[PDB]
């Protein structure tokens, strides 16, 4: 449970980050949101990560989050928003 993963962070970087990277013992994540649309990334602690990486299909705002456990797997990830409901 000692941090071993190095991730790219953007928008969710801790104050002591270095060159837009954070270290963690969980996952690296990328996320797109709306309301307009934006892209962010960061480090996610291991505990509670299954809840956050799954997210809820019934969130009010459309967004997609993706997780990975490989150094800087964050870097280049482009989740795609859920199709608008019609």
């Amino acid at each position: 449970t000692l941090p071993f993963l190095k991730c790219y962070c953007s928008g969710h970087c801790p104050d002591d980050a270095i060159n837009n990277t954070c270290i963690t013992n969980g996952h690296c994540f990328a996320i797109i949101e709306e309301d307009e649309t934006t892209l962010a990334s960061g480090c996610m602690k291991y505990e509670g990560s299954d809840f956050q990486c799954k997210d809820s299909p019934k969130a009010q705002l459309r967004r997609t989050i993706e997780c990975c456990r490989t150094n800087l797997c964050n870097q280049y990830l482009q989740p795609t928003l859920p199709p608008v409901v019609i």
Partner: protein, 104 residues
């Protein structure tokens, strides 16, 4: 504006008006936590599972509040004050200084 984080807050015992019973120190850095707890909660926000779940629920229905930015680590400090007896006493106050913040 931004996420949950520690902020500076210096408490001068004269500004609050306690220099009449607190002889030392003349003040101290207390700090304070403040800021939003968004989804997802990042590693450095060191939050509990409940906070995680509560944050997701708020995403499904905003009637439920978001987690709160509060101290998660605190250190003590020593002070020299005058008790009713007019005598200087040394006391060590716990949890006086915010060392770290998080979402709960």
């Amino acid at each position: 504006k931004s996420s949950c984080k520690r902020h500076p807050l210096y408490v001068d015992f004269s500004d609050v008006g306690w220099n009449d019973w607190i002889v030392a120190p003349p003040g101290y850095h207390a700090f304070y936590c403040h800021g939003e707890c968004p989804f997802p909660l990042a590693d450095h926000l060191n939050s509990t599972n409940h906070a995680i779940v509560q944050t997701l629920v708020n995403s499904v229905n905003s009637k439920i509040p978001k987690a709160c930015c509060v101290p998660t680590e605190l250190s003590a400090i020593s002070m020299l004050y005058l008790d009713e007896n007019e005598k200087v006493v040394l006391k060590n106050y716990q949890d006086m200084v915010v060392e770290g913040c998080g979402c709960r």
